[PDB]
Amino acid sequence: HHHHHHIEVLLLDVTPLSLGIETMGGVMTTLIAKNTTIPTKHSQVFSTAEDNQSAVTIHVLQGERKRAADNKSLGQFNLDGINPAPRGMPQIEVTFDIDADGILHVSAKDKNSGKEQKITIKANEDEIQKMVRDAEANAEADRKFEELVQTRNQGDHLLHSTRKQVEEAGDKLPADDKTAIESALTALETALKGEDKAAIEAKMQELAQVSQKLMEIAQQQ
Amino acid sequence: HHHHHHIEVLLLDVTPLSLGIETMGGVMTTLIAKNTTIPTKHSQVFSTAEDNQSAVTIHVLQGERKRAADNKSLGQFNLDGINPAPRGMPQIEVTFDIDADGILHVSAKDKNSGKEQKITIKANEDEIQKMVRDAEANAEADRKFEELVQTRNQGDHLLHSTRKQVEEAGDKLPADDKTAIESALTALETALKGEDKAAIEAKMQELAQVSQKLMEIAQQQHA
Numbered sequence A: 001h002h003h004h005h006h007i008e009v010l011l012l013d014v015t016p017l018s019l020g021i022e023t024m025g026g027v028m029t030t031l032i033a034k035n036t037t038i039p040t041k042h043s044q045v046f047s048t049a050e051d052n053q054s055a056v057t058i059h060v061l062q063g064e065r066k067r068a069a070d071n072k073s074l075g076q077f078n079l080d081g082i083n084p085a086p087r088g089m090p091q092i093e094v095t096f097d098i099d100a101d102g103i104l105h106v107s108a109k110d111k112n113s114g115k116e117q118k119i120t121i122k123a124n125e126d127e128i129q130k131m132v133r134d135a136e137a138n139a140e141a142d143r144k145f146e147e148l149v150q151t152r153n154q155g156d157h158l159l160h161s162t163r164k165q166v167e168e169a170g171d172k173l174p175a176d177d178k179t180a181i182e183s184a185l186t187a188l189e190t191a192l193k194g195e196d197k198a199a200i201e202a203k204m205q206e207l208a209q210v211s212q213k214l215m216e217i218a219q220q221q
Numbered sequence B: 001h002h003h004h005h006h007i008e009v010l011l012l013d014v015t016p017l018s019l020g021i022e023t024m025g026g027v028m029t030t031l032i033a034k035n036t037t038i039p040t041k042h043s044q045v046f047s048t049a050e051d052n053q054s055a056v057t058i059h060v061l062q063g064e065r066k067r068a069a070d071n072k073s074l075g076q077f078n079l080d081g082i083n084p085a086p087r088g089m090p091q092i093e094v095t096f097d098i099d100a101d102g103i104l105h106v107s108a109k110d111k112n113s114g115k116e117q118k119i120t121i122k123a124n125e126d127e128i129q130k131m132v133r134d135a136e137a138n139a140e141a142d143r144k145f146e147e148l149v150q151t152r153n154q155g156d157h158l159l160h161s162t163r164k165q166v167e168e169a170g171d172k173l174p175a176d177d178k179t180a181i182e183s184a185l186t187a188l189e190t191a192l193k194g195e196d197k198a199a200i201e202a203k204m205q206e207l208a209q210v211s212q213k214l215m216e217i218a219q220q221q222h223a
């Protein structure tokens, strides 16, 4: 009683360690997780970290730790030529492609300009298990580090965008709100220098709660 | 910042449940695992399950269970027009793309012909945690099921290639070896209907024990 539309998985190999890139704050962002079946192709879209940034550096990493510096370095390259735009607007697609020969191809492409750059990384046993074990021993500190960096980066963006809004609003912003917002901005700046995720979240919320008039002001444009 | 070549994640959003397709034996094969940051595009190449198969069905699934039937079905489509070839030779690339708006694009492309079909899927917190808890409660049964399917598919491939080798050997195969191989093939066929991975593995080894001359004939023919 057979049917004839079935699809079969081709199982040739799996990756021994995670593969990814370094991102803002010294974090390893994974593109291909440990144990992914190969051949495979994974991409994710990234952006710039400051206004009018013209280039990014892709640092290719191998390992299970969240701090980039605690992983193995496989290679690096730049993608130049990113057209001037606000932080976070350019769309840079980073693709990790592993072929049947086990060769890793990494590329970064600007989705807007089409500019592309790429590298090829050519295809341990006790070192692998050592690295897996080093990660388990630091799993808690690594999670806390990753969450802190994410929170800091979100807080830095909010700091910068809010200051920009204050400047554009000018005399349209009531003095009481401006005082409240400036105080909240300074408090968030101080929190961002620390290592306490909860304090940064609280200062971000305290800032949003006093900044509601900025959005309304922008709309009268 | 003191330096100016930094790269940042575009969004923080992640997928709530794993996304994949149904594969031979009723298994969900994941293309994008749960908690993957978006936008993301993941592709993998699959193939046909029988010789000269001309079409495949892509059944898109969402969830954490290994049996396809235990996950949510999000849609299906066929890719037809596949040129005749041995099982496992056609290269069908399946791509899952989730854009910044959270919209899922699934496509299947025949790498030979460039023929392509696709669907767009537009995508529930208590149901999510429900589905997660049930996958953990059933982790062992699910793994046993997946491992059984993998062993069955291997045994079926072996049944088929051995029968092919026997037909190619013809009169070169001694009658006694042919009998023993036929008997071992029947035993394996019977084991494949069961639910015991070890019995199937044992029948595969027993087949290797009686196929030595068949393999020697096979090698000399390859020569």
Ligand SMILES: [Ca+2]
Pocket (backbone or CB within 6 Å): A022, A023, A024, A025, A026, B005, B006, B007, B008
């Ligand atoms: Ca960086």
